[PDB]
Design a protein around this ligand. Structure first.
Ligand SMILES: [Ca+2]
Ligand SMILES: [Mg+2]
Length: 880
């Protein structure tokens, strides 16, 4: 910016320096007033018990204190079960919040940038945190540029600038003083901090050592510190406490028979302490109706979803948001590095004949000119693939070796067969590089370069025999094949094989005369193969996708056509067009275009804001600083595993393997988490209402109260904590995909839940009431005890089809979930122990043998379940 307009000498006039040396007379002083290089002193678990952290949501811990004031004066009377159920619920929550695995990789991402620099006229390797403005620092293909600056020494230099602004192909570097560019960085020819150099030699004056750097300026947009809530943070419990509190208001009128409420004589003049019993039954009813475990359910169902992503090399942070990827509808992407592999690979070879479209593997089934094209493509390289595959050197030569890997013929054998006989390394001004080798013991000249440069020098072409191209019908074919490749946006390279006569001396600068052309190699950064299926899965899932990248438009059109995103009927859209019209018309054209090219990091904010503004939950995936603002403005951010540490820290999802199908897997676990969180609470809410109507029906006819305070705590202990948690582990529901993303305008009150729990609660109420009326034969220990066991049996047995709203409890239901089987078994045996313990016998004193009517009561409980079963048939029938 601007620095480019002035020369390399005028730029340092403002910034005190001599471009060389910079003794400590200023370095030891002005660096402090200038500030330090690093921005990392910005933005960067206690777990003493961490159960207090869970003790901050609306609780019953204050309510349970009132239990002691009534439980005192009796050694066996005291009931601490309500106190101890909640602490156990927190214990499982905190241990499942730990997940036996922390948000690791926190120690993995270490920058530790080092720069080889000249201080006080001496050669050293000073830490990048100590670079001073105006400093003279050399560059090589073993590190990256540590600070923004202006180049002084220029030759055979290009850098991988695409990490911060998004050109897949590297940009060349040379000294220039063109003032009339924009300043994005695609042509400024200025070193931008953090960018990896390709190869060559670099030596530049360090202009900016501060947050003023372009990478630091990107963090200036990150500096806004945008903190928001989670889309599921809306709390229906706030309405539930209103309903629960209202029941308590009616509950003090439930015990209207008391002398203080009956307004009648014939009873004790004093109100007879039954208020405490009424108050005891009131809070016990209230704590039964209160979905206390619902808050604990949220943590457990989310933690396992994060744990499942940990086995897919998709470790994530910010646990409370994993269903967001399940609820998204539009996905923002980022061409460079995010879809492409950030590794240039040759995908199409063309020869003037070019008979074969796929390069044959075994050389025995090759073509005639294919050998020469490979030989020049393996010998005219400056890279090397070591025993691990380090790909040291320029990426284009790595693609040539990658081509040599396709045929299984390693480049090392040919490089060993003909080591070298002298060569002219590539220089920026003359885009050519020629290497001399031996063919059938005869010295041969091999030169490679740009397409049009060779088309000016393609004085011969050989595929079966060397001959003049007559500058027509073959040179035109080179023009049309170069043109279509440019239409495909491929950095096509042309290769030539010249017959050096007999003994060859050193190759002079002008030896590429009468160079016989071999063929053309077309290379382009290809998208990862994982994104092919990831789109067909997303396309059928009703999740729209848009690609945004600051690369050139021609590349943006080529990709997407290979992915299916491009409409193939309209031109792509560029960032400058957004400014041409108001943002409301941008919303109009937002849905009729899916590719955006040449967009600033701020241009990503406006589009991602518009997607959020239209009510669709958006997600941003990318690598590099050119994506950090969009990640935060998106309520869910996905950082590529190979991106800059700025991107990984800013976003909320990391894919260490750099896989892309994990996003679909993260979508699926997010959808299942929402269904589990929408069904686990549906089960407890439905059964809790069944208890309410049981009390309510006894009110209208003033039946004996059908429940006892000690058992309300017990049913809650066994049908509000364990079964709810187990249902949160519900198997992968049938076709969790193929469903359009859940509408964010609808809460848990959607038809799928309310139109089911309402019927579910009524069926419970009918069952328990029948038990009371059947139990009306004897009021004590028969009318009140018989109803308790039916509710416990009915409540814990209807979980069979509360496991899934699609799969039948028996037709498609099995012991698929060991958690629900264990929870069902544990609550069953625990109740079975406590019905015939021989020590307590809340049931009638005759227990475990006077079961002749316990069968019908148990059968009555199953009758509701089988009547609940036909509701499943109703779900699967046409009557819906
Ligand atoms: Ca409860
Ligand atoms: Mg990128």
């Amino acid at each position: 910016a601007e620095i480019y307009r002035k020369s390399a000498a005028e730029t340092f006039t403002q910034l005190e320096a001599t471009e060389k040396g910079l003794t400590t007379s200023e370095v030891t002083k002005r660096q402090e007033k200038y500030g330090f290089n690093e921005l990392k002193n910005k933005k960067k678990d206690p777990l003493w018990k961490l159960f207090l952290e869970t003790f901050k949501d609306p609780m019953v811990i204050v309510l349970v204190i009132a239990a002691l004031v009534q439980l005192v004066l009796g050694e066996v009377v005291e009931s601490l079960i309500i106190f101890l159920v909640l602490i156990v619920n927190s214990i499982i929550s905190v241990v499942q919040t730990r997940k036996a695995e922390s948000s690791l990789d926190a120690l993995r991402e270490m920058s530790a940038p080092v720069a080889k620099v000249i201080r006080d006229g001496s050669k050293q390797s000073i830490h990048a945190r100590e670079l001073v403005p105006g400093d003279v620092v050399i560059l090589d293909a073993g590190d990256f540029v540590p600070a923004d600056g202006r180049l002084f020494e220029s030759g055979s230099l290009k850098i991988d600038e695409g990490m911060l602004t998004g050109e897949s192909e590297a940009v060349e570097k040379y000294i220039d003083t063109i003032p009339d560019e924009v300043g994005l960085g695609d042509r400024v020819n200025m070193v931008f901090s953090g960018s990896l150099v390709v190869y060559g030699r670099g030596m530049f004056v360090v202009t900016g050592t501060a947050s003023e750097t372009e990478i630091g300026k990107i963090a200036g947009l990150l500096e806004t510190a945008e903190a928001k809530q989670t889309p599921l943070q809306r709390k229906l419990e706030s309405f539930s406490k209103k309903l629960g509190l209202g029941i308590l208001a009616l509950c003090v009128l439930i015990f209207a028979v008391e002398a203080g409420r009956v307004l009648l004589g014939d009873n004790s003049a004093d109100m007879a302490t039954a208020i405490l019993n009424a108050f005891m039954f009131a809070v016990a009813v209230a704590v039964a109706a209160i979905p206390e475990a619902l808050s604990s359910i949220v943590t457990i169902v989310l933690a396992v979803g994060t744990n499942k992503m940990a086995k897919q090399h998709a470790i994530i942070r910010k646990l409370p948001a994993v269903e967001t990827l399940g609820s998204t509808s539009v996905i923002c992407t980022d061409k460079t590095g995010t879809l492409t592999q950030n590794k240039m690979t040759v995908v199409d070879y063309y020869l003037p004949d070019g008979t074969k479209e796929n390069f044959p593997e075994s050389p025995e089934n090759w073509s005639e000119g294919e050998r020469r094209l490979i030989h020049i493509a393996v010998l005219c390289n400056d890279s090397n693939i070591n025993s691990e595959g380090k790909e040291l050197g320029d990426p284009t030569e790595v693609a040539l070796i990658a081509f040599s890997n396709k045929n299984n013929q390693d480049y090392n054998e040919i490089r060993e067969k003909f080591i070298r006989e002298g060569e002219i390394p590539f220089d920026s001004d003359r885009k050519l590089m020629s290497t001399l080798h031996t063919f059938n013991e005869n010295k041969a000249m091999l030169t490679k370069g740009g397409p049009d440069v060779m088309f000016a020098r393609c004085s011969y072409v050989f595929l079966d025999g060397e001959e003049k191209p007559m500058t027509e019908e073959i040179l035109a074919k080179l023009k049309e094949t170069n043109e279509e490749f440019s239409n495909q946006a491929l950095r096509v390279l042309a290769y030539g094989y010249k017959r050096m006569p007999a003994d060859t001396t050193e190759l002079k600068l002008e030896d590429e005369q009468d160079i016989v052309l071999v063929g053309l190699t077309a290379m382009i950064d290809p998208p990862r193969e994982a994104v092919y299926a990831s789109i067909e899965e997303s396309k059928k899932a009703g999740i729209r996708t848009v690609m945004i990248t600051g690369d050139h438009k021609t590349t943006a059109q080529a990709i997407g056509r290979d992915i299916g995103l491009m409409d193939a009927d309209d031109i792509a859209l560029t960032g400058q067009e957004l400014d041409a019209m108001p943002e409301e018309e941008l919303d109009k054209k937002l849905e009729h275009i899916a590719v955006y090219a040449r967009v600033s990091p701020e241009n990503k904010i406006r589009i991602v804001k518009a997607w959020q503004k239209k009510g669709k939950i958006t997600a941003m995936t990318g690598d590099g600083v050119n994506d950090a603002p969009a990640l935060k403005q998106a309520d869910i951010g996905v950082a590529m595993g190979s991106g800059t540490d700025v991107a990984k820290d800013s976003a909320a999802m990391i894919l260490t393997d750099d896989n892309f199908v994990s996003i679909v897997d993260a979508v699926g676990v997010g959808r299942t988490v929402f269904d589990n969180i929408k069904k686990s609470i549906a089960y407890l809410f439905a059964g809790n209402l069944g208890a309410i109507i049981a009390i309510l029906f006894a009110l209208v006819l003033d039946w004996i109260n059908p429940f006892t305070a000690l058992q309300l705590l017990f049913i809650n202990l066994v049908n509000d904590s364990l079964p709810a948690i187990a249902l949160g582990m519900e198997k992968a529901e049938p076709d969790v995909m193929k469903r359009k993303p859940r509408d964010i305008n609808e809460g848990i009150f959607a038809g799928g839940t309310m139109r089911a729990v309402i019927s579910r609660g009524v069926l419970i109420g009918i069952a328990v009431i029948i038990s009371q009326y059947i139990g009306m034969q004897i009021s004590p220990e028969m009318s009140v005890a018989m109803a308790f066991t039916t509710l416990i049996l009915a409540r814990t047995l209807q979980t069979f089809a509360a496991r899934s709203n699609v799969q039948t409890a028996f037709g498609a239901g099995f012991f698929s979930n060991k958690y629900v089987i264990g929870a069902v078994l544990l609550c069953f045996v625990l109740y079975g122990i406590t019905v015939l313990p021989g020590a307590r016998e809340i049931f009638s004193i005759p227990a475990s043998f006077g079961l002749h009517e316990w069968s019908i009561a148990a059968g009555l409980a199953l009758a509701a379940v089988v009547m609940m079963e036909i509701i499943k048939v109703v779900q699967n029938k046409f009557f819906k």
